[PDB]
Design an enzyme around this catalytic site. Structure first.
Site, PDB file in Angstrom:
ATOM      1  N   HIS A  65      80.234 -14.954  69.550  1.00  0.00           N
ATOM      2  CA  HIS A  65      80.930 -13.766  69.008  1.00  0.00           C
ATOM      3  C   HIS A  65      81.166 -12.675  70.079  1.00  0.00           C
ATOM      4  CE1 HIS A  65      77.239 -11.356  68.982  1.00  0.00           C
ATOM      5  NE2 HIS A  65      76.626 -12.450  68.557  1.00  0.00           N
ATOM      6  N   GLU A  67      71.982 -16.520  64.213  1.00  0.00           N
ATOM      7  CA  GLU A  67      71.186 -16.254  65.412  1.00  0.00           C
ATOM      8  C   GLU A  67      69.710 -16.545  65.175  1.00  0.00           C
ATOM      9  OE1 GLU A  67      70.832 -16.611  68.260  1.00  0.00           O
ATOM     10  OE2 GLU A  67      71.422 -14.855  69.467  1.00  0.00           O
TER      11      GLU A  67
END
Ligand SMILES: [K+]
Ligand SMILES: [K+]
Length: 204
Positions: free
Chosen positions: A11, A76
């Site tokens: 990202h 994550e």
């Protein structure tokens, strides 16, 4: 037997949204990837990843009819989740990925030498029609690459330094692997995995 490409993107600069710089990184990556047809898109449930994926797709010339799938397995590392737990999530994601690709694209579509690497966006995937995009997070992606390279049978091309292979991924850094999979004893397994490029950031 099925061969497919996987493009992996971290990202942009940041359940926070992207920063303005983040948006621009994602647009630059979208422009870089614009002539690629992604037949499948997978993204973590976190906004920063979703927005990156949305921007990449909004810049793409071919992939308008491809639906984005949110997969929590791509989240994550929980900062506290162990590195082994994160790896397990990637292993589960790969299982899901192989099943999804095989089910959708089947074994009559794309059925261990160096791929063509010209320093362009389509490196290693010029003749690979099935192409999945994965948008995820830095620690997860780093652990995923280690798994692909170390734990599995894996090929890496000429001139790719291991230092680069195991480097941390920059925001919107792009990696690419080519998978060949087949059903062995009812279980789908990768026969070949070819690394193409890792953590590429030419677009920045
Ligand atoms: K290996
Ligand atoms: K090599």
């Amino acid at each position: 037997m099925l061969t497919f490409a996987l493009t992996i993107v971290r990202h942009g600069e940041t359940d926070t949204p992207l920063s303005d710089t983040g948006h621009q990184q994602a647009a630059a990556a979208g422009r870089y990837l614009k002539d690629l047809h992604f037949t499948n898109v997978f993204v973590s449930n976190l906004q920063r990843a979703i927005q990156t994926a949305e921007i990449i797709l909004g810049n793409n010339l071919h992939s308008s009819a491809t639906e984005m799938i949110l997969d929590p397995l791509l989240r994550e590392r929980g900062f506290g989740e162990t590195l082994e737990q994160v790896k397990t999530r990637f292993k589960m994601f790969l299982k899901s990925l192989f099943q999804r690709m095989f089910e959708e694209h089947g074994s009559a579509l794309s059925s261990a030498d160096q791929p063509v690497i010209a320093g362009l966006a389509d490196d290693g995937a010029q003749n690979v029609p099935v192409h999945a995009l994965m948008v995820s997070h830095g620690a997860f992606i780093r652990i995923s690459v280690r798994h692909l390279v170390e734990d599995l049978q894996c090929c890496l091309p000429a001139g790719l330094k291991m230092n680069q292979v195991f480097s941390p991924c920059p925001n919107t850094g792009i990696s690419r692997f080519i998978f060949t999979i087949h059903r062995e004893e009812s279980v789908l397994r990768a026969t070949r995995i070819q690394g193409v490029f890792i953590n590429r950031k030419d677009h920045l």
